[PDB]
Amino acid sequence: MSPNGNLIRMLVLFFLESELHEHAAYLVDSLWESSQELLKDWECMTELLLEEPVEEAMSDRQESALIELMVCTIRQAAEAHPPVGRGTRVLTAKERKTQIDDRNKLTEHFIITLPMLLSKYSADAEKVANLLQIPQYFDLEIYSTGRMEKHLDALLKQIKFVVEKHVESDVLEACSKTYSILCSEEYTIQNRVDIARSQLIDEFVDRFNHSVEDLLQEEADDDDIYNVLSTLKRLTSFHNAHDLTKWDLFGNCYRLLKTGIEHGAMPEQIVVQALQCSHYSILWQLVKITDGSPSKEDLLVLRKTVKSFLAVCQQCLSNVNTPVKEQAFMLLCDLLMIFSHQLMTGGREGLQPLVFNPDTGLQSELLSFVMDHVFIDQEANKIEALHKRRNLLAAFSKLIIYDIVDMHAAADIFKHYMKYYNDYGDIIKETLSKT
């Protein structure tokens, strides 16, 4: 009750204060055999999180740490295996039984308690994002079984509050994925969630559209810019896992990107998001066309869309802001692979009119970026920025392998940059081998 409450408070302290466990998931995993009973006292945890003190309060950091530990215990309980990077087998009868029992407990519990947790910590993005990892583990059918419809409403109310209050890409993506899990994985609740999710979108599409018009008709305000970006961010987040094509979003993103090209003065984040959103619209347009039996004119309308967007991403290579370039590049190396001749695989030869070969000028520019932005002269931010450039190359690399860009002019650049390995590598190798 409060005995487990002391232990858990001290366990949060031992995690934070000692750098003996760096990963929460690993700490939990390590203790799991010995301290399962304690680590699945979820009523204790939510209590510690939700109650007000008598004495000694929790500090903001330790609350955060508790939530993270809690989410890790939930996973391990639900999944019944160690986390990614500690894995290795059959569940025994009793282990399976415990898994079903634990899943039931945490679902009933968290259905009721997750809306409350989200309410209290609604503005703490890192906490909210961490809490919204929880529904993926629920036994969704219990939203019907328990006559628990009141708490699904409750959750959806809070998810609405979160998206409405936040712009962080983690928070938003966490929300999107959550609607995703509540939607498609039970018919009973599907109709209810779809109604709440579609009403949410609507409110933002209207705000976005009004804001798009505000900005473009306009001397443009900081408000105008915050409204366009803020709303767009929400929609782009969702547009990855939700098919928002019924709202013609591609049109207003295209206006923001063309205005930015013409007059040069569109904020980098609006441009980056507008690109990402348009891209997501396009992929979803494709999915509807693959799966349906499309006519000639369907294909020809999608083609014109794609040609007009590849034109835009090309032009965006020349944007001063290097995040735009990277995004534009990323999308080019995505799209030119997608609308390659691969598109006519699996008896899909109807799609020929959608195939695109990038011209010489575009291949030259897709070489240019690599010379300028993968291969550059000159803590935690640099190990991250490296893996990005690594991905930018790996995405370019696919175009080389299938002769979509000039495979010889590419390799020439790879020569030029590997020169010091070919000229002095052996000598540097053997030298370091004797020290």
Ligand X SMILES: O=C(CC1CCCCC1)Nn1cnnc1
With contacts defined by CB under 6 A, name the span among 2-10, 229-237, 307-315, 372-380 that binds ligand X.
229-237
Segment 142 to 161, residues that bind ligand X, using CB under 6 A: none
CB 284 within 8 A of CB 240: no
Residue whose CB is less far from ligand X, 80 or 216:
216
CB 367 within 8 A of CB 413: yes
Q: Helices 222-239 and 249-263 meet at what angle, rounded to 10?
A: 130
- Nearest approach in angstroms of CB 273 to ligand X is 9
Residue whose CB is less far from ligand X, 122 or 190:
122
Residue whose CB is less far from ligand X, 177 or 233:
233
Which of 120, 188, 226, 409 touches ligand X (CB under 6 A)? 226
Burial classification of residue 378, based on how many CB atoms lie within 10 Å of its CB (0-12 exposed, 13-18 middle, 19 or more buried): exposed
- Nearest approach in angstroms of CB 207 to ligand X is 12
- Nearest approach in angstroms of CB 232 to ligand X is 8
CB 91 within 8 A of CB 99: yes
Closest CA to 242 of 294, 283, 188, 296: 283
Closest CA to 31 of 86, 79, 109: 86
Residue whose CB is less far from ligand X, 226 or 375:
226
- Nearest approach in angstroms of CB 275 to ligand X is 15
CA distance 75 to 81: 9
Residue whose CB is less far from ligand X, 24 or 212:
212
Closest CA to 229 of 200, 202, 266, 280: 266
Is residue 269 within the footprint of ligand X (CB under 6 A)? yes
Is residue 127 within the footprint of ligand X (CB under 6 A)? no
Residue whose CB is less far from ligand X, 112 or 167:
167
CB 314 within 8 A of CB 365: yes
CB atoms within 10 A of CB 181: 17
Residue whose CB is less far from ligand X, 167 or 241:
167
- Nearest approach in angstroms of CB 167 to ligand X is 4
CA distance 310 to 316: 10
Segment 389 to 408, residues that bind ligand X, using CB under 6 A: none
Q: What is the DSSP string of 294-356?
A: --HHHHHHHHHHHHHHHHHHHHHHT-SSHHHHHHHHHHHHHHHHHTSGGGG-TT-GGGGGG--
With contacts defined by CB under 6 A, name the span among 12-20, 128-136, 226-234, 394-402 that binds ligand X.
226-234
Residue whose CB is less far from ligand X, 47 or 168:
168
CB atoms within 10 A of CB 371: 12
Residue whose CB is less far from ligand X, 14 or 226:
226
DSSP conformation class of 137: G
Which of 36, 133, 230, 368 touches ligand X (CB under 6 A)? 230
CA distance 252 to 216: 10
Interior CA angle at 188 toward 187 and 193, to 5°? Answer: 85
- Nearest approach in angstroms of CB 241 to ligand X is 20
CB 293 within 8 A of CB 301: no
Is residue 77 within the footprint of ligand X (CB under 6 A)? no
- Nearest approach in angstroms of CB 269 to ligand X is 6
With contacts defined by CB under 6 A, name the span among 128-136, 222-230, 362-370, 426-434 that binds ligand X.
222-230
With contacts defined by CB under 6 A, name the span among 107-115, 138-146, 223-231, 325-333 that binds ligand X.
223-231
Is residue 200 within the footprint of ligand X (CB under 6 A)? no
CB 90 within 8 A of CB 100: no
Number of residues binding to ligand X, judged by CB under 6 A: 6
Residue whose CB is less far from ligand X, 99 or 269:
269
- Nearest approach in angstroms of CB 214 to ligand X is 14
CB 279 within 8 A of CB 294: no
Which of 128, 159, 189, 229 touches ligand X (CB under 6 A)? 229
Residue at token pair 């010489």: 360
**Interaction mask 160-179, ligand X, x per CB under 6 A:** -------x------------
With contacts defined by CB under 6 A, name the span among 33-41, 48-56, 122-130, 224-232 that binds ligand X.
224-232
Is residue 233 within the footprint of ligand X (CB under 6 A)? yes
- Nearest approach in angstroms of CB 233 to ligand X is 5
Kindly list the residues in this chain that would bind ligand X in the complex (CB under 6 A).
167, 226, 229-230, 233, 269
